[PDB]
Amino acid sequence: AEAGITGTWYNQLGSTFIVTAGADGALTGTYESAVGNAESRYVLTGRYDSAPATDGSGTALGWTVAWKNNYRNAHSATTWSGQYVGGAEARINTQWLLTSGTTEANAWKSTLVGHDTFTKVKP
Amino acid sequence: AEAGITGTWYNQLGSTFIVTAGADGALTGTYESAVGNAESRYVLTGRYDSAPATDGSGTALGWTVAWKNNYRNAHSATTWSGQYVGGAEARINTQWLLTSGTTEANAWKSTLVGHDTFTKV
Amino acid sequence: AEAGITGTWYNQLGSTFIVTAGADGALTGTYESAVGNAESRYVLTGRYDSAPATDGSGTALGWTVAWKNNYRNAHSATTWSGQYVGGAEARINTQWLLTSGTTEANAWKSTLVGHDTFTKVKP
Amino acid sequence: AEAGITGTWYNQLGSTFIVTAGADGALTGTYESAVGNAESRYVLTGRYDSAPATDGSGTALGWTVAWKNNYRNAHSATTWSGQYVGGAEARINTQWLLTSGTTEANAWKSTLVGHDTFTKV
Ligand SMILES: O=C1N[C@H]2NC(=O)N[C@H]2N1
Ligand SMILES: O=C1N[C@H]2NC(=O)N[C@H]2N1
Ligand SMILES: O=C1N[C@H]2NC(=O)N[C@H]2N1
Ligand SMILES: O=C1N[C@H]2NC(=O)N[C@H]2N1
């Protein structure tokens, strides 16, 4: 649902996710990470299932943040893939992939995998 | 390099990816998968490092596709994370996450992982 | 440390992991899953860093369970990769990959990825 | 098929994997990586479906390598999960997880993921 996803969300590391769910299935907003070679806000763009099921199923969605802004460039991008679960305590449970740009040689070790949970605060 | 991400790419499954990379890091286009509960094109949006490093590195990028369009709603979303490398042969090497919208009971098995390599061939 | 890893462990799904850490860096034991096309115990085999660092670093380790035993055969295998963190509340935090055997055609969708946390109970 | 997993396999990085598949599902052998903070062989142990399905499916298997041996201790472990397919050309297609032992502060970035394909060539 757009309304449920739109808002301010934070995860266990203390990072901030600000998102708006457009009715066409789009997500736009900013991401502030609490860890990494990252400083300030970064632009995020994603997509979500604007039409989930009447099943207590989560709404699938995903987004990307390239870790480059006007203050820093970390030459990497992360994509979060998870599902939004609404209710009184709405959560977005995800798994993510962080890929750094590398030489063909260190490519075998270019992606880190992790998982974050987001708790909503504001709309 | 970078600006050369714009174009039509194909992966080993025969899926077609059409992207436009914008001056500031945005990625926009349509995706058409050869496999799955998917038909026709789906919209995709992503981001890429618009200022990759000397050095001899690839350009990090990623994008998302919610598999819902005027034809099908497969209640899932896929995100590809990888890097683009240009040269006589340019490719995009990625690892993807496909999450379906499940009930809690099946949440443990909601995400598939795989890897795709795209070329303009 | 072998002693710290050896014991009975359970995760958030309610599955049981019984393991013994041999001094050569080996792990052997049984796994009982609470979910899936699984019934009874399954054999697990793994390896761990018998020599972690004097740094509050976790001990890296991994293990595999082929979901075949005398009662069921699910034609799949899972590998858990994580780190053991000892203390009063010892945990093993992992990320796992579950691969099912498939036809070359459905191979694109043969692996599921997830993460489990194990809490120790007994040695 | 299955019993044919025994042998020496090589992956695209040039790493060598030597395994013995036992009648009941066990996998034993040594691994030697072409890349990383690793030197010589390391011991590996794993498991495989000793009774794969008609159908036309691969045999699911997985194994672990703790990168510690009499030469180096890289304080990490890698697990490969995949399936073996036999035929004139047999391969093992895998996705792996490499976890390093970190302090909590760096736990978020302790696991790398990748994919390897092994052949007997
Ligand atoms: O909040 C964060 N999530 C994690 N994933 C990532 O790429 N950086 C970390 N920060
Ligand atoms: O091209 C495709 N890549 C794979 N991942 C995914 O989500 N669907 C499949 N199609
Ligand atoms: O305890 C379990 N862990 C999960 N991973 C897996 O493969 N099956 C599930 N059961
Ligand atoms: O052959 C290798 N595979 C890759 N994964 C890993 O752990 N080290 C690398 N070497």
XYZ file of C-alpha atoms and ligand atoms in Angstrom:
528
model
C 0.000 0.000 0.000
C 1.616 3.375 -0.717
C 0.474 5.097 2.454
C 1.839 2.325 4.663
C 5.280 2.379 3.030
C 5.596 6.137 2.834
C 7.230 7.549 5.976
C 10.420 7.497 7.934
C 11.960 4.103 8.776
C 15.155 3.125 10.791
C 16.885 -0.239 11.044
C 18.993 -1.979 13.662
C 22.203 -0.204 12.659
C 20.591 3.215 13.215
C 20.363 4.171 9.472
C 17.437 6.332 8.284
C 15.307 5.523 5.234
C 12.807 8.256 4.053
C 10.470 6.985 1.265
C 7.378 7.933 -0.683
C 5.389 5.205 -2.509
C 3.916 6.615 -5.761
C 0.726 5.022 -7.056
C 2.490 3.736 -10.171
C 4.541 1.363 -7.968
C 7.493 3.728 -7.550
C 9.526 4.478 -4.455
C 11.798 7.605 -4.147
C 13.386 9.045 -1.064
C 16.709 9.284 0.706
C 18.883 6.919 2.740
C 21.298 7.887 5.540
C 23.574 4.926 6.600
C 25.074 4.720 10.019
C 27.969 2.636 8.804
C 30.394 2.579 5.876
C 32.280 5.123 3.750
C 29.062 7.103 3.698
C 28.163 10.650 4.786
C 24.819 12.538 4.576
C 21.881 11.527 2.462
C 21.878 9.474 -0.692
C 19.130 9.168 -3.274
C 17.235 5.880 -3.466
C 14.841 4.699 -6.190
C 12.825 1.490 -6.083
C 9.563 -0.225 -6.990
C 6.916 -2.084 -4.966
C 3.854 -4.217 -5.703
C 1.162 -1.567 -5.736
C -1.314 -4.492 -5.682
C -0.298 -7.076 -2.974
C -2.640 -9.995 -2.122
C -5.939 -9.953 0.816
C -3.860 -12.835 2.182
C -1.762 -11.294 5.567
C 0.990 -11.405 2.781
C 3.761 -8.818 2.812
C 4.135 -6.429 -0.128
C 7.269 -7.167 -2.101
C 9.499 -4.188 -2.917
C 13.168 -3.325 -3.526
C 15.356 -0.224 -3.830
C 18.842 0.924 -4.738
C 21.263 3.473 -3.262
C 24.559 4.183 -5.229
C 26.824 5.473 -2.508
C 27.725 8.669 -4.272
C 26.391 12.122 -3.336
C 28.005 15.630 -3.203
C 30.159 14.812 -0.199
C 31.302 11.334 -0.782
C 31.697 8.717 -3.462
C 32.216 5.180 -2.205
C 32.052 3.558 -5.673
C 29.488 1.029 -4.558
C 25.680 0.462 -4.715
C 23.347 -1.572 -2.517
C 19.953 -3.054 -3.420
C 17.540 -4.070 -0.641
C 14.897 -6.720 -1.545
C 12.280 -7.563 1.121
C 8.616 -7.286 1.983
C 6.599 -4.706 3.874
C 4.302 -6.020 6.549
C 1.806 -3.431 7.837
C -0.142 -3.419 11.094
C 0.416 -1.504 14.329
C 4.130 -2.351 14.197
C 4.940 -2.223 10.514
C 8.213 -3.678 9.392
C 10.111 -4.008 6.169
C 12.279 -7.139 6.321
C 15.013 -7.264 3.738
C 18.159 -8.925 2.509
C 20.638 -6.753 0.690
C 23.598 -6.986 -1.659
C 26.380 -4.316 -1.564
C 28.602 -4.411 -4.675
C 31.796 -2.324 -4.896
C 33.330 -1.534 -8.272
C 36.604 -3.549 -8.582
C 39.314 -4.637 -10.990
C 38.425 -7.911 -12.878
C 40.856 -9.557 -10.478
C 39.115 -8.676 -7.190
C 35.723 -9.181 -8.609
C 35.281 -12.563 -6.833
C 35.038 -10.497 -3.634
C 32.973 -7.515 -4.856
C 29.606 -8.266 -3.125
C 28.687 -8.388 0.508
C 25.281 -9.839 1.511
C 23.337 -8.851 4.708
C 19.864 -8.344 6.081
C 18.220 -5.356 7.740
C 14.920 -4.844 9.469
C 13.179 -1.496 9.351
C 10.760 -0.173 11.932
C 8.552 2.662 10.990
C 8.231 5.855 12.886
C 6.510 8.647 10.873
C 4.602 8.862 7.562
C 32.335 3.074 -19.669
C 29.352 4.461 -17.570
C 27.338 6.334 -20.289
C 27.762 3.058 -22.269
C 25.393 1.344 -19.869
C 22.653 2.903 -21.963
C 21.418 0.349 -24.478
C 19.748 -3.049 -24.808
C 21.399 -5.881 -22.953
C 20.566 -9.524 -22.870
C 21.450 -12.080 -20.084
C 22.057 -15.845 -20.343
C 18.370 -16.628 -19.925
C 17.473 -14.442 -22.938
C 15.845 -11.729 -20.841
C 16.126 -8.233 -22.366
C 17.091 -5.200 -20.317
C 16.789 -1.756 -21.941
C 18.357 1.136 -19.897
C 19.058 4.780 -20.064
C 21.736 5.931 -17.654
C 21.302 9.651 -16.796
C 24.113 12.133 -16.114
C 23.471 12.067 -12.411
C 23.293 8.327 -11.518
C 19.818 7.361 -12.427
C 18.943 4.232 -14.275
C 15.540 3.930 -16.078
C 14.132 1.410 -18.546
C 12.020 -1.718 -19.063
C 12.763 -5.434 -18.369
C 11.362 -8.427 -20.063
C 12.199 -11.848 -18.441
C 12.448 -15.034 -20.467
C 11.569 -17.023 -17.339
C 8.917 -16.925 -14.694
C 5.440 -15.740 -13.955
C 6.124 -12.679 -16.039
C 4.894 -11.478 -19.463
C 5.771 -8.380 -21.489
C 7.903 -5.579 -20.096
C 7.993 -4.287 -16.544
C 9.353 -0.927 -15.475
C 12.703 -0.792 -13.671
C 14.480 2.040 -11.883
C 17.986 1.901 -10.386
C 21.120 3.940 -9.642
C 24.838 3.686 -10.670
C 28.082 5.395 -9.555
C 28.134 8.338 -12.005
C 31.773 8.899 -11.023
C 33.520 5.416 -10.941
C 37.171 5.365 -9.913
C 41.873 4.973 -12.505
C 41.671 3.027 -11.953
C 40.845 -0.257 -13.719
C 37.422 -0.768 -11.912
C 33.888 -1.458 -13.028
C 30.982 0.845 -12.330
C 28.766 -0.304 -9.421
C 24.976 -0.148 -10.106
C 21.719 -1.837 -9.167
C 18.048 -1.748 -10.128
C 14.662 -3.076 -9.078
C 11.729 -4.619 -10.980
C 8.389 -5.263 -9.206
C 6.853 -7.936 -11.423
C 3.488 -6.278 -11.803
C 2.323 -4.752 -15.060
C -1.000 -4.477 -16.988
C -0.722 -8.158 -17.773
C 0.582 -9.931 -14.634
C 1.108 -9.302 -10.904
C 3.456 -12.041 -9.636
C 3.588 -10.330 -6.145
C 7.348 -10.220 -6.095
C 10.278 -7.960 -6.733
C 13.772 -8.586 -7.919
C 16.853 -6.399 -7.313
C 20.082 -6.857 -9.308
C 23.364 -5.489 -7.712
C 26.563 -5.685 -9.810
C 29.035 -3.716 -11.904
C 29.335 -2.721 -15.500
C 32.647 -3.090 -17.330
C 33.136 -1.641 -20.746
C 35.686 -2.522 -23.385
C 35.448 -4.229 -26.765
C 33.132 -6.580 -24.850
C 31.092 -4.804 -22.177
C 29.037 -6.629 -19.609
C 27.137 -6.180 -16.445
C 27.885 -8.880 -13.896
C 25.151 -9.169 -11.234
C 23.749 -11.205 -8.297
C 19.995 -10.765 -7.706
C 17.456 -11.201 -4.925
C 13.858 -12.137 -5.823
C 11.490 -11.726 -2.810
C 7.880 -12.862 -3.039
C 5.262 -11.428 -0.709
C 4.535 -14.367 1.695
C 2.520 -14.816 4.921
C 4.821 -15.044 8.020
C 4.653 -18.868 7.899
C 6.529 -18.897 4.577
C 8.661 -15.808 5.068
C 11.718 -18.043 5.732
C 11.526 -19.168 2.082
C 10.529 -15.886 0.355
C 13.871 -14.971 -1.243
C 15.714 -16.604 -4.137
C 19.270 -15.573 -5.088
C 20.986 -16.056 -8.391
C 23.455 -14.298 -10.689
C 23.105 -12.907 -14.255
C 25.592 -11.605 -16.768
C 24.329 -9.250 -19.460
C 26.045 -8.406 -22.777
C 24.768 -6.415 -25.799
C 24.898 -9.646 -27.836
C 36.625 -22.678 20.639
C 35.370 -26.272 20.476
C 33.801 -26.352 23.919
C 31.795 -23.191 23.274
C 30.373 -24.468 19.979
C 29.652 -27.982 21.163
C 26.136 -28.253 22.613
C 22.522 -27.944 21.693
C 21.403 -24.805 19.823
C 17.899 -23.640 18.561
C 17.030 -20.797 16.208
C 14.040 -18.523 15.741
C 12.082 -21.057 13.690
C 12.318 -23.641 16.493
C 14.819 -25.976 14.686
C 17.380 -27.915 16.765
C 21.096 -28.067 15.947
C 23.248 -30.589 17.977
C 27.015 -30.185 17.275
C 30.404 -31.313 18.497
C 33.518 -29.267 17.577
C 36.523 -31.604 17.091
C 39.969 -30.167 17.762
C 40.975 -30.560 14.115
C 38.409 -27.875 13.170
C 35.593 -30.322 12.420
C 31.929 -30.083 13.307
C 29.554 -33.148 13.248
C 26.107 -33.462 14.703
C 22.472 -33.512 13.694
C 19.928 -30.922 12.564
C 16.146 -31.061 13.100
C 14.275 -28.346 11.052
C 10.940 -27.028 12.110
C 9.990 -26.123 8.578
C 10.189 -27.656 5.104
C 9.813 -31.115 3.542
C 11.860 -32.385 6.454
C 11.201 -34.989 9.167
C 13.459 -36.218 12.027
C 17.171 -35.676 12.252
C 19.615 -35.103 9.449
C 23.384 -35.416 9.540
C 25.434 -32.221 9.355
C 29.185 -31.862 8.767
C 31.111 -28.599 8.881
C 34.370 -26.881 9.794
C 35.253 -23.954 12.076
C 38.322 -21.826 12.793
C 39.862 -23.777 15.638
C 42.110 -20.714 16.140
C 39.995 -17.464 16.116
C 41.612 -14.106 17.032
C 42.044 -12.411 21.089
C 40.100 -9.611 19.395
C 36.064 -9.977 20.741
C 35.939 -11.458 17.115
C 33.476 -14.231 16.333
C 34.768 -17.630 15.206
C 33.927 -18.282 11.583
C 32.357 -21.661 10.788
C 29.953 -23.291 8.309
C 28.052 -26.565 7.913
C 25.934 -28.542 5.484
C 22.769 -30.640 5.825
C 21.566 -32.619 2.682
C 17.893 -33.055 3.399
C 17.885 -36.792 2.984
C 17.659 -39.300 5.854
C 15.817 -42.670 6.278
C 12.384 -41.077 6.395
C 12.517 -38.372 3.862
C 14.450 -37.166 0.863
C 13.820 -33.561 -0.124
C 16.519 -33.476 -2.842
C 18.058 -30.326 -1.456
C 21.025 -29.248 0.755
C 21.592 -26.145 2.865
C 24.906 -24.614 3.963
C 24.976 -22.179 6.903
C 27.938 -19.722 7.028
C 28.203 -17.454 10.101
C 30.245 -16.748 13.196
C 30.025 -17.972 16.767
C 30.129 -15.330 19.444
C 30.656 -16.726 22.960
C 29.899 -15.098 26.304
C 27.020 -15.607 28.733
C 24.549 -15.513 25.832
C 26.394 -17.250 23.036
C 25.003 -16.936 19.564
C 25.827 -18.255 16.146
C 24.668 -15.735 13.532
C 24.423 -17.118 10.040
C 23.230 -16.640 6.503
C 22.281 -19.740 4.588
C 21.734 -20.969 1.049
C 19.206 -23.793 0.332
C 19.681 -25.332 -3.136
C 17.161 -27.827 -4.561
C 18.165 -30.156 -7.379
C 16.326 -29.009 -10.570
C 16.141 -29.452 -14.324
C 18.587 -27.122 -16.237
C 15.493 -25.074 -17.019
C 14.421 -24.250 -13.442
C 17.916 -23.807 -12.274
C 17.614 -19.974 -12.232
C 15.316 -20.501 -9.232
C 17.138 -23.335 -7.416
C 18.556 -21.404 -4.391
C 16.822 -19.675 -1.551
C 18.869 -17.400 0.761
C 17.988 -16.675 4.459
C 19.514 -16.003 7.839
C 19.108 -17.749 11.182
C 20.269 -16.965 14.671
C 21.060 -19.736 17.110
C 20.879 -19.484 20.874
C 22.642 -22.050 22.900
C 21.084 -24.104 25.591
C 23.215 -27.145 26.605
C 26.772 -28.359 25.890
C 25.722 -38.740 -11.996
C 26.262 -38.646 -8.132
C 29.228 -41.096 -7.738
C 30.782 -39.018 -10.583
C 31.188 -36.115 -8.193
C 34.318 -37.910 -7.049
C 37.314 -36.424 -8.834
C 39.310 -33.224 -9.299
C 37.342 -30.200 -10.382
C 38.495 -26.750 -11.245
C 36.419 -23.472 -11.121
C 36.774 -20.290 -13.209
C 39.305 -18.806 -10.806
C 41.603 -21.841 -11.213
C 40.940 -23.166 -7.718
C 41.173 -26.973 -7.449
C 38.604 -29.035 -5.583
C 39.336 -32.739 -5.008
C 36.355 -34.775 -3.605
C 35.354 -38.237 -2.705
C 31.610 -38.742 -2.515
C 30.739 -41.671 -0.186
C 27.830 -44.094 -0.629
C 25.839 -42.432 2.092
C 25.993 -38.677 1.259
C 29.284 -37.601 2.617
C 31.670 -35.387 0.778
C 35.395 -35.280 1.795
C 38.481 -33.776 0.168
C 40.878 -30.821 -0.011
C 40.491 -27.321 -1.572
C 43.133 -25.080 -2.909
C 42.010 -21.485 -3.832
C 43.706 -19.478 -6.554
C 42.590 -16.280 -4.812
C 42.738 -14.862 -1.347
C 44.577 -15.054 1.912
C 44.963 -18.762 1.386
C 47.940 -21.022 0.546
C 48.140 -24.773 -0.056
C 45.198 -27.083 0.526
C 42.552 -26.826 3.213
C 40.295 -29.642 4.334
C 36.634 -29.590 3.287
C 33.682 -31.710 4.366
C 30.159 -31.561 2.911
C 27.048 -33.613 2.112
C 25.072 -34.415 -1.113
C 21.688 -36.039 -1.887
C 22.796 -39.685 -2.268
C 19.404 -40.396 -3.852
C 18.656 -37.518 -6.371
C 15.326 -37.661 -8.181
C 13.701 -39.133 -13.098
C 13.801 -37.126 -13.403
C 16.122 -34.748 -15.286
C 17.490 -32.992 -12.078
C 20.918 -32.237 -10.701
C 22.184 -33.546 -7.396
C 22.045 -30.971 -4.561
C 25.231 -30.760 -2.401
C 27.252 -28.323 -0.324
C 30.546 -28.184 1.557
C 32.528 -26.004 3.936
C 36.182 -24.899 4.076
C 37.534 -23.050 7.153
C 40.570 -21.286 5.708
C 42.995 -22.375 8.383
C 45.760 -24.870 7.735
C 49.415 -25.346 8.853
C 50.346 -22.397 6.689
C 47.599 -19.750 7.071
C 44.626 -18.896 9.311
C 42.528 -16.309 7.435
C 39.822 -16.460 10.225
C 37.038 -17.162 7.794
C 34.959 -19.938 6.354
C 33.313 -20.431 3.029
C 30.308 -22.664 2.239
C 29.367 -23.593 -1.348
C 25.691 -24.722 -1.983
C 24.796 -25.922 -5.509
C 24.069 -28.949 -7.673
C 26.083 -31.346 -9.725
C 24.957 -32.300 -13.228
C 26.639 -35.066 -15.109
C 26.690 -35.760 -18.818
C 29.398 -35.551 -21.467
C 30.194 -32.279 -19.673
C 29.601 -32.459 -15.920
C 29.685 -29.440 -13.679
C 28.883 -28.252 -10.249
C 27.088 -24.916 -10.241
C 27.348 -23.129 -6.868
C 26.747 -19.879 -4.915
C 29.009 -19.415 -1.865
C 29.073 -17.479 1.394
C 32.442 -16.404 2.852
C 32.087 -15.165 6.484
C 35.052 -13.638 8.288
C 35.164 -13.554 12.072
C 34.576 -9.818 12.876
C 33.965 -7.778 16.059
C 30.264 -6.702 16.374
C 31.100 -3.283 14.866
C 31.956 -4.909 11.523
C 29.567 -7.842 11.657
C 27.273 -6.069 9.132
C 30.031 -6.499 6.519
C 31.364 -9.985 7.427
C 29.848 -12.007 4.568
C 30.708 -12.011 0.867
C 28.586 -13.911 -1.683
C 29.621 -15.095 -5.091
C 29.067 -18.013 -7.467
C 31.467 -20.647 -8.906
C 31.119 -23.245 -11.613
C 33.442 -26.242 -11.506
C 34.266 -28.625 -14.387
C 36.879 -31.426 -14.626
C 38.676 -29.363 -17.294
O 21.815 0.801 6.922
C 22.661 0.177 6.339
N 22.402 -0.942 5.767
C 23.620 -1.707 5.362
N 23.822 -2.054 3.919
C 24.727 -1.324 3.346
O 25.055 -1.383 2.188
N 25.239 -0.504 4.210
C 24.694 -0.651 5.591
N 23.902 0.483 6.186
O 16.308 -12.541 -16.345
C 15.948 -12.981 -15.276
N 16.674 -12.970 -14.199
C 16.138 -13.834 -13.114
N 15.773 -13.183 -11.798
C 14.509 -12.919 -11.709
O 13.980 -12.257 -10.856
N 13.878 -13.476 -12.691
C 14.758 -14.157 -13.687
N 14.810 -13.532 -15.038
O 16.022 -24.214 10.759
C 15.898 -24.028 9.578
N 16.653 -23.209 8.940
C 16.164 -22.886 7.566
N 17.037 -23.190 6.387
C 16.640 -24.228 5.719
O 17.183 -24.697 4.752
N 15.556 -24.701 6.251
C 15.056 -23.921 7.420
N 15.047 -24.570 8.778
O 37.741 -20.696 -5.537
C 37.363 -19.809 -4.806
N 36.116 -19.504 -4.610
C 35.925 -18.199 -3.922
N 35.206 -18.194 -2.591
C 36.021 -18.186 -1.586
O 35.727 -18.349 -0.432
N 37.226 -17.977 -2.006
C 37.363 -17.911 -3.491
N 38.123 -19.028 -4.120
